[PDB]
Ligand binder design. Structure first.
Ligand SMILES: CC(C)CC(=O)C(=O)O
Ligand SMILES: CC(C)CC(=O)C(=O)O
Ligand SMILES: [Cl-]
Ligand SMILES: [Cl-]
Ligand SMILES: [Mg+2]
Ligand SMILES: [Mg+2]
Ligand SMILES: [Mg+2]
Ligand SMILES: [Mg+2]
Ligand SMILES: [Mg+2]
Ligand SMILES: [Mg+2]
Ligand SMILES: [Mg+2]
Ligand SMILES: [Mg+2]
Ligand SMILES: [Mg+2]
Ligand SMILES: [Mg+2]
Ligand SMILES: [Zn+2]
Ligand SMILES: [Zn+2]
Lengths: 338, 338
């Protein structure tokens, strides 16, 4: 008998768990590896040399090997001879899916663990339980690799601009790839962070485009008063940067949008990626609500609907505004034409 | 044009993300809610009354309502009139799947965030970065609801015992349900924790079985020298308790297993659930490796293969040992007959 009862429970249990064990394990292995610096050396097209990577990362090589042997058992890498490991063929998709888990469970963990304090004294909780910006940045890039970054890339590229401006450039990755794909164009990577700009500047020298790529280390709010760098841009790009100005700096935000419209060359457009609040459709609703609740309740940053965004961009002077659904749940791309 | 490029990127992005956004959001909402005490009041068959639950949980009712309105938007609960919410029909499956994410990303977070310290000075890291046992316990119960708990329940029930002994009872939930399903039987819930035993004892009075259910507050290692409580048991149950004795207390472990064999009534068996290390098959391997790496590398607790378990149980005197694959990846149920 016992063989048969355990047989149905096994089948029923397999169905109930579904893909969650796999994703749970992938997310933990990949966050742990990324914190160690290992994940950046894993790629499906080349091998990681443990002897060299352990020295680059200042890890004891036996400890690094035990880690890679665990993720090899997990099936996320392939051992290609002693001391060499290569990521599994679909590694980048697995890493992308882990970005969602890392964002809600790791980047936003202070909100998960301390919700009571936020409900009691939001001001004290907001400056006591703060997010790790490196985890926010990495999980966002993982989520963006397949869910919003390619749409922006292909859109800017297709317009074939000659002057691109990226508000909140950070890594400057978007600029390097639009310059390397459209000939003769130039780019400007505005970003306030010192940390994001030294690492960006050297990668500008890496590609060898320092003549075409300016990096100014100012805030995006500085555009409201000093919109000089924008002059003549064919595409101005803004990825998930505007909602941090709302609702506290709405006037500055509306001024930056109006300066953006004024400063575009004819036929140019402003391409904004951002998150709309609490969608209802079955695909997007669950992650939408997580993005919306984290922002509304814990960060008190205003997410705007498509209607609000369209009205705000048309009040900034833009003739026509197109909204494009992104694969990233609750993410929208707004193309605001001059 | 831009409509069409964004159309393929959307479809491609939807495929790449798959179920990860949904699970990411579900896990964060449900861990946050469980930490608040809310999740225990959510059930698909009855409503949560915000006015009363906010008082029971000592939360400001407006804050609780904003939380439930977010998870309602997420689709995890249904508003059934003002102030009343009911969990979505498949809530228990979603909660089960979130148990895997909560276990690897939350319960085991000290290992994710501090792997460098463990690689450098394991002894210092092991007592510096310790897991939250409440999160370990809750995520384990969520994982077990559909992946290993029903198999043990149905197995013990089907044997129709008259004396059941649960090593590491903790919640005493397993005992209450085997006593409530087989008539005239008695149970013993051995567990070292004071915290786990006061809450268990009152629930014994809740069901009204305090005459049939003994609760002794001893360690399972105390069975190696004092196996008195086991005498005459038809089923002895041990859920994920033995690997914490290995490899440091192997002699005590082998003594408990031998005392278990000796103490069984004729036809009785010892039912052990535990985790085998690093499986290779495609379904189990990824989560297997996570369970195995957390235990081997960070907790230094020995997981045994089916072969090692069979040999150890036969060395303890058991005539025949059956191994049963559980839905819980890398989980196995061993039935060791007298
Ligand atoms: C929604 C993410 C893409 C980034 C973000 O806005 C945040 O984490 O605050
Ligand atoms: C494998 C889990 C079921 C429990 C466990 O063994 C642990 O978290 O240490
Ligand atoms: Cl004009
Ligand atoms: Cl005998
Ligand atoms: Mg089952
Ligand atoms: Mg099945
Ligand atoms: Mg499954
Ligand atoms: Mg290691
Ligand atoms: Mg979703
Ligand atoms: Mg895409
Ligand atoms: Mg598709
Ligand atoms: Mg999808
Ligand atoms: Mg709230
Ligand atoms: Mg698995
Ligand atoms: Zn944000
Ligand atoms: Zn364990």
């Amino acid at each position: 008998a016992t063989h048969d009862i355990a047989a149905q429970h096994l089948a029923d249990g397999i169905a109930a768990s579904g893909p969650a064990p796999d994703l749970a394990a992938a997310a933990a292995f990949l966050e742990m590896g990324d914190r160690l610096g290992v994940v950046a050396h894993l790629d499906p097209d080349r091998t990681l040399e443990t002897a060299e990577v352990a020295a680059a990362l200042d890890l004891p090589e036996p400890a690094l090997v035990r880690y890679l042997d665990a993720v090899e058992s997990a099936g996320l890498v392939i051992r290609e001879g002693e001391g060499r490991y290569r990521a599994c063929p679909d590694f980048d998709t697995i890493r992308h899916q882990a970005g969602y888990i890392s964002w809600t469970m790791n980047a936003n963990r202070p909100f998960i663990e301390n919700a009571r304090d936020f409900f009691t004294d939001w001001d004290k909780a907001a400056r006591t339980h703060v997010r790790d910006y490196r985890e926010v940045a990495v999980s966002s890039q993982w989520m963006g690799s397949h869910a919003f970054y390619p749409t922006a890339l292909a859109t800017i590229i297709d317009a074939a601009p000659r002057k691109v401006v990226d508000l909140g450039a950070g890594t400057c990755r978007l600029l390097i790839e639009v310059l390397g794909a459209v000939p003769g164009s130039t780019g400007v990577g505005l970003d306030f962070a010192a940390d994001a700009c030294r690492a960006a500047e050297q990668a500008v020298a890496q590609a060898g485009m320092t003549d075409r790529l300016t990096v100014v280390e100012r805030t995006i709010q500085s555009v409201a008063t000093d919109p000089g760098v924008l002059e003549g841009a064919d595409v101005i790009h803004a990825g998930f940067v505007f909602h941090d100005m709302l609702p506290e700096e709405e006037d500055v935000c509306d001024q930056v949008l109006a300066n953006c419209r004024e400063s575009l060359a004819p036929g140019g457009f402003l391409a904004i990626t951002d998150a709309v609040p609490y969608l209802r459709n079955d695909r997007e609703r669950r992650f939408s609500a997580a993005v919306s609740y984290y922002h509304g309740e814990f960060m008190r940053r205003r997410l705007q609907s498509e209607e609000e965004w369209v009205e705000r961009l048309r009040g900034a002077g833009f003739s026509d505004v197109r909204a494009l659904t992104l694969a990233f749940p609750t993410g929208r791309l707004f193309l605001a034409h001059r």
